[PDB]
Amino acid sequence: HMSLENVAFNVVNKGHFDGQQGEVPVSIINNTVYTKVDGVDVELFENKTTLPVNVAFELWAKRNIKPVPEVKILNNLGVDIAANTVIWDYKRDAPAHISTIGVCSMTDIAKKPTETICAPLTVFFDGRVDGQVDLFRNARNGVLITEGSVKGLQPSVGPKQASLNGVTLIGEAVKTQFNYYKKVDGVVQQLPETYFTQSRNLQEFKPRSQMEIDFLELAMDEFIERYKLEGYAFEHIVYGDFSHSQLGGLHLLIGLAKRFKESPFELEDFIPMDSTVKNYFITDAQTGSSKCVCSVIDLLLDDFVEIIKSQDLSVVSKVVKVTIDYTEISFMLWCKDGHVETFYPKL
């Protein structure tokens, strides 16, 4: 007996959908769900999705509340849909996937991933749920995560972090490090060797290596000299150039963080979704330097140093492809006279 009122009962009494019986009275108005508590309406859910309000409400209530892959990972791996769960996209306040399997009668294309409608879709499977490894083995297209080994299957070690109710974290009381597996057209695919982005934010930025501690603490010329970085244009790429009307460089999140602790600046997130490379319309409050499309990636600084130091500096311009978060990211590399001029994720 699935219903709007029953979903609301679960939210009010359990914090989310938990399969409990019961009903509470509900009002729908203005894309918002309310319920009566002692004779006044209390807001339970504001629909920010493109789905109907009561449908979105049910999907949100049925969201996965265990650590799950960040949406950008699932996207980069080509995931279309999840088996018997909802991956809630907290950056968009919306379901990560349009359709569902065994979740909601308005969005379900199937009750079970073994139905033939699911065959051409890349289904996400969670080895922590009973039977789902087996369902991946029988699926034509899919992505599987597990905490441990699956007999015969060659694993890919995923990122250290995962998302728990919209909080991205490296778990200590829970496990957030998964093995990853993928199948295309019935055939297991070798996932590529890859870097992972670090999913940090500007206000709460915290370093994760001695080099990153050195970066935030040392002045620019000291850091560059210590890590033998002359000729790699870190003054431009990482620290940023605020001297001209067009803001120069500034493509590593750690660089933004250092600048932010001194003087604030405005980041307009004009495509607000989770992705490996983010684009911001940036305006520096101190100088007035700005840039309409500033591509930013949060790599561990050691990894960015490793990447840029392995490049051939004898070419004037080169497209460098780097595998990050399981996807190929193109960088523009500009050199002159054997040193880097600039190096940025290509637009």
Place this chain on the structure above:
Amino acid sequence: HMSLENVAFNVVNKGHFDGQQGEVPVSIINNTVYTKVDGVDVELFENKTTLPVNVAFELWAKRNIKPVPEVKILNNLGVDIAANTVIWDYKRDAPAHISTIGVCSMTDIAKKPTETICAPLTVFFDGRVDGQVDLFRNARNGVLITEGSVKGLQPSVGPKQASLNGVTLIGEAVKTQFNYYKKVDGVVQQLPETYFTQSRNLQEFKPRSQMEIDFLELAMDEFIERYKLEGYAFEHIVYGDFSHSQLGGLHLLIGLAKRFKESPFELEDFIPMDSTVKNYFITDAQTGSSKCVCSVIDLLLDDFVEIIKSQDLSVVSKVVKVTIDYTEISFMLWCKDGHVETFYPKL
């Protein structure tokens, strides 16, 4: 001559409704009220209520702008409606009560509380307004607040704090401590002896006793040893246990505050209203420990210590009823071998 345009005149010129004559031009669109200032529309009010936009606008403009009881107190006392004022619920951005008396022609059930429609309703009366004590004496059901004594009536001393335009505060330039009185079916009721919650928030938390100062400053084992608290499971109840996937304990706001000053965590307020006991879906950003329904109460720590120390520890499980904010709050008490295992507000 009451009107939308006149209400808007008062808001623009006086900050709220003040009974002044005048009109300004108004536009209504998208549940929002606008007015023209020099030929551009300026937003005056966004309707977040379940009432029609212009009705909600008028009630908000007519909100009481003196210190008033917090909504949770009025709710716990059974208040249905206020006499000739609007108690605005700043936690819901909505009127605390569905109907009104002598306020608004769309929501009024009566012009005066003496009309017979009001008799079965518990009417809130404010002794600071002329004639309202007398109206309480003649009302069949009601709650009265005063700053001083009412001849013959046995008072109940209320909380130290009250709400002034949505700010909860202990007044120094104004009085926020009221006497409380209540009548049911024409008969004055003795209000019970009660604790009061402290209405503090996580970011702005400030202690209010030497014990609370000691709690935030001392380490756990020092605080417990100083206040002779061994065997009362404060390590679980108050400090919180973040070692397992399910977050243990953590039911006193002061405990959350201590944890917050060290590492942040996410509180999902999934029933956003004022109440004596709040329920949060909590996720700890550092460990990944979480809990779907974490009941939290902001008692003075001395009061919580007094409560828990008066309990009988010879039973395995017991429902303990405590009067807080004039309402009976049920606690689950779990003991083993003469010590507390856990003690939480019952769900």
Place this chain on the structure above:
Amino acid sequence: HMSLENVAFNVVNKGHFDGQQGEVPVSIINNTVYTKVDGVDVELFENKTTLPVNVAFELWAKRNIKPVPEVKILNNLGVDIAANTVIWDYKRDAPAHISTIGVCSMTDIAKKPTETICAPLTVFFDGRVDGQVDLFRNARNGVLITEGSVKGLQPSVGPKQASLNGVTLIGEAVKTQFNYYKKVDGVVQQLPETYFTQSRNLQEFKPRSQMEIDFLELAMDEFIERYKLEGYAFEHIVYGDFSHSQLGGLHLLIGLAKRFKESPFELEDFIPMDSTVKNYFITDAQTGSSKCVCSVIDLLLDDFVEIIKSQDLSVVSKVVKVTIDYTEISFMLWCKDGHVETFYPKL
């Protein structure tokens, strides 16, 4: 080939409208513009204006992204409309002007400012755009800004600060100081000698003279004695009086800033637009002192001292007119026995 889809293409790929060819798929629902990125809808724009959603979207995308006069300056100068650009009002999330010239086919009253419909309107011209000085010379009503001199025209030096994508700043990598010129009925008008407000905010307040540094650092009686301010009621006007239920004085932003660094307070911005004088419904969290209409101006403290010290203190009450941001601001001056009682922007 102007279109909704083309505007969205520019936003997605360039951060704003940039005249590039291309289309992306778009969805409109709930006053919001979305676009598909890999098969999920992503929000590009939430319409907060009184215009239709797709019209507002286009105006916002075509906003001027160079430093521009703050909206309050343009308003005070009587600007009705801009020539071939959009001044976006970041305080209202809406176009500063109702109509446009050569911007958008839904809001255009003309393609060029020389069309006769524009003659009775005060058109804003930007000397940094080719041909616009000449268009001002031929316009019947207008306001012109330039970075340098215009032959024959007597300039007015404007404020040091301007707005860049909603950030108000004194430019170091860009120029934000303009000359101002104005024409009424075909005749250049002498702009008056004027003070300028400083456009600072409460949380990020930073002093801009030795006197202002002294104000934030020194105690009240020391500051008053140092700058020979006895008898000018700074204890009331600038520092604020929180002892009675009605909050006294507190009309200089710098005074609010000092108070805020010690104990927080609530400012209800009940007419949320840019203006030289702002009105707030203020509630002091510490004392409960409040005031429905508290007029606040952010003058440099030196300027406020210069203003108040030039006043005649032999009258009981006087309306003092001061030119600020090119507009006449009326102050009420109350004196008794040769000293200031109060001095505030008149309501």
